[PDB]
């Protein structure tokens, strides 16, 4: 606690490298 | 007299009294007949807050005593973790050898501190650095039986540095007083994390102004630009730090700069809403029709996080309405996706198409009658929506909804006059989606129809 903020990992999760990204456009096809 | 006083007060973590012997001029590199300066004696003695002041004060962080032992050194074989992790945060060599080829991983792990050589590896310290004798860390754990230090040393193995850069970790707290004596030491500010950012990003990240522009001022690139492609103003532009966005302009930041999905800074603001962010950038000229890879433009994004105001501050600067993605789909599309009916209001309230076709025919009614959003529904049923349009395979609003079982959807359409015995491009009415998914409320009231 009060520390983990400086470790990479923590960092990358913190940072949300995903929120950059395009997820996808769903459609979810009715028929199947 | 004046030089041994300081050294006294130093060795005895008295910051009064060696505070007024440097401002009486007192040299702060001076040292004793050993070669311990302030910054070693202080180390020596765990006294962190005469180890900062001294360090604020500009000593050479590596000086080394007549047997090559640096502060870190000192502070490793006194088991004095306070002070190795400030010594660490200030850019100490972790990996400095003495005249005996001794690493301060070796003393910390011959004298049994266990903290001091979990601290150390994490901070990137060789394990396999030998003295001149050829023993390592691991060999002198073994022979002084220190079973903790040795267990530790094995399973660590070669993890490696996974502590962020000195750099980093100041710019995480806004630490400019850490940050430029880093900076003086190693004038490279764009020092690399794995992930790849720059001390530049953590600060953006947090806001933290201040370490922002000592960085900028000693050379950082505003403009970095990481594998992933994502700038500091990306990162200013989606946490909504609008000052930052303010100073990042100003320093010479792209507008235009795309991330590896093609994401703009005014994509990353509009998708999380952040209205002055926004109105900042375009009025910078970032371009309000840019595009990701799916086609998404900021609208579309602003429409998907139901962003009201953001959607209304994109239509005010001339963002085309009814713009579409690969998928073809609309922002009105994607507020029918998601249920935000206030984003579709405004929508259509300034224009925008009621009757959009995707790429298989759905309209924006076929999607709000598909994932029961009654409201967006309602909304676009008062606004000239065909309440009998077909997609490519025949399939009608009360079709949609009768497959998904919505009898609040099936409910409304009927009573709107929707009728219940068209056919799909297999002569399939709502009934048969009904029966076929068995859902018997919606069945019921379509029969109790003229169904």
Redesign the interface.
Same mark, same amino acid.
């Given at each position: 606690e009060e520390l983990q903020?400086?470790?990479?990992?923590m960092?990358?999760e913190?940072?949300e490298?995903e929120?950059?990204?395009?997820p996808?456009?769903?459609?979810?096809?009715?028929?199947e | 007299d004046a030089a041994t006083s300081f050294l006294r007060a130093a060795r005895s973590g008295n910051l009064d009294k060696a505070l007024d012997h440097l401002r009486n001029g007192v040299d702060i590199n001076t040292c004793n007949q050993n070669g311990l300066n302030g910054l070693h004696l202080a180390s020596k003695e765990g006294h962190v807050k005469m180890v900062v002041e001294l360090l604020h004060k500009e000593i050479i962080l590596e000086t080394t005593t007549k047997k090559g032992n640096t502060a870190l050194h000192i502070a490793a074989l006194a088991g004095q973790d306070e002070v190795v992790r400030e010594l660490v945060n200030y850019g100490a060599n972790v990996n400095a050898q003495s005249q005996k080829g001794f690493t301060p991983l070796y003393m910390a792990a011959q004298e049994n501190h266990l903290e001091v050589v979990k601290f150390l590896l994490?901070n990137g310290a060789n394990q396999n650095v030998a003295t001149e004798d050829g023993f390592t860390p691991l060999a002198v754990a073994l022979q002084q039986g220190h079973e903790n230090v040795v267990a530790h040393l094995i399973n660590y193995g070669t993890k490696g540095?996974?502590? +962020?850069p000195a750099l980093?970790?100041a710019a995480?707290n806004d630490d400019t007083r850490t940050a430029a004596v880093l900076l003086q030491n190693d004038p490279n500010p764009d020092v690399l994390?794995?992930?790849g950012?720059t001390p530049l990003?953590?600060a953006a990240?947090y806001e933290n102004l201040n370490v922002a522009q000592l960085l900028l001022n000693r050379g950082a690139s505003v403009n970095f630009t990481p594998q992933?492609?994502?700038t500091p103003l990306?990162?200013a532009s989606?946490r909504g730090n609008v000052i930052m966005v303010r100073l990042l302009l100003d320093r010479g930041a792209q507008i235009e700069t795309k @991330?590896?999905?093609? +994401?703009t800074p005014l994509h990353?603001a509009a998708?999380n809403g952040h209205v002055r962010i926004s109105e900042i950038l375009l009025d910078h000229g970032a371009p309000i029709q840019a595009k @990701?890879?799916?086609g998404?433009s900021p609208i579309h994004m602003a429409a998907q996080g139901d962003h009201l105001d953001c959607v209304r501050l994109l239509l005010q600067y001339d963002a085309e309405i009814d713009d579409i993605?690969?998928?073809h +789909?609309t922002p009105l599309h994607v507020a029918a996706?998601c249920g935000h009916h206030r984003v579709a209001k405004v929508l259509l309230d300034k224009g925008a198409k009621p009757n959009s076709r995707a790429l298989?025919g759905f309209t924006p009614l076929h999607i709000a009658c598909?994932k029961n959003h009654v409201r967006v529904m309602e909304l676009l049923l008062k606004t000239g929506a065909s309440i009998d349009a077909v997609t490519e395979?025949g +399939?009608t609003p009360l079709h949609?909804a009768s497959?998904?079982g919505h009898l609040p959807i099936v409910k409304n359409l009927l009573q709107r006059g929707a009728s219940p015995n068209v056919s799909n491009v297999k002569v399939e009415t709502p009934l048969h989606m009904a029966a076929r998914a068995g859902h018997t409320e919606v069945a019921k009231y379509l029969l109790q129809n003229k169904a």
């Amino acid at each position: 606690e009060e520390l983990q903020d400086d470790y990479e990992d923590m960092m990358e999760e913190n940072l949300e490298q995903e929120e950059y990204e395009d997820p996808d456009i769903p459609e979810s096809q009715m028929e199947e | 007299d004046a030089a041994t006083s300081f050294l006294r007060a130093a060795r005895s973590g008295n910051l009064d009294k060696a505070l007024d012997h440097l401002r009486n001029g007192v040299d702060i590199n001076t040292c004793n007949q050993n070669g311990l300066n302030g910054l070693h004696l202080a180390s020596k003695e765990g006294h962190v807050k005469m180890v900062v002041e001294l360090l604020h004060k500009e000593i050479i962080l590596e000086t080394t005593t007549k047997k090559g032992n640096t502060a870190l050194h000192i502070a490793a074989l006194a088991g004095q973790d306070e002070v190795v992790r400030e010594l660490v945060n200030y850019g100490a060599n972790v990996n400095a050898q003495s005249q005996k080829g001794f690493t301060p991983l070796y003393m910390a792990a011959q004298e049994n501190h266990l903290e001091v050589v979990k601290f150390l590896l994490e901070n990137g310290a060789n394990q396999n650095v030998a003295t001149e004798d050829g023993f390592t860390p691991l060999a002198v754990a073994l022979q002084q039986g220190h079973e903790n230090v040795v267990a530790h040393l094995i399973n660590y193995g070669t993890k490696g540095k996974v502590r +962020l850069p000195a750099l980093h970790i100041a710019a995480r707290n806004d630490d400019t007083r850490t940050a430029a004596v880093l900076l003086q030491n190693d004038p490279n500010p764009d020092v690399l994390s794995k992930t790849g950012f720059t001390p530049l990003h953590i600060a953006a990240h947090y806001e933290n102004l201040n370490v922002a522009q000592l960085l900028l001022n000693r050379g950082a690139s505003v403009n970095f630009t990481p594998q992933n492609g994502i700038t500091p103003l990306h990162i200013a532009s989606r946490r909504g730090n609008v000052i930052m966005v303010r100073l990042l302009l100003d320093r010479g930041a792209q507008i235009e700069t795309k @991330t590896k999905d093609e +994401l703009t800074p005014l994509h990353c603001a509009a998708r999380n809403g952040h209205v002055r962010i926004s109105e900042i950038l375009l009025d910078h000229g970032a371009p309000i029709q840019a595009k @990701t890879k799916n086609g998404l433009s900021p609208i579309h994004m602003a429409a998907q996080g139901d962003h009201l105001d953001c959607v209304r501050l994109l239509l005010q600067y001339d963002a085309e309405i009814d713009d579409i993605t690969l998928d073809h +789909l609309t922002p009105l599309h994607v507020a029918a996706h998601c249920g935000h009916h206030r984003v579709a209001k405004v929508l259509l309230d300034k224009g925008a198409k009621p009757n959009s076709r995707a790429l298989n025919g759905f309209t924006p009614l076929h999607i709000a009658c598909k994932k029961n959003h009654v409201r967006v529904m309602e909304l676009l049923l008062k606004t000239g929506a065909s309440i009998d349009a077909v997609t490519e395979s025949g +399939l009608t609003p009360l079709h949609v909804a009768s497959f998904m079982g919505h009898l609040p959807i099936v409910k409304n359409l009927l009573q709107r006059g929707a009728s219940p015995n068209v056919s799909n491009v297999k002569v399939e009415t709502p009934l048969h989606m009904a029966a076929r998914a068995g859902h018997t409320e919606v069945a019921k009231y379509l029969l109790q129809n003229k169904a």
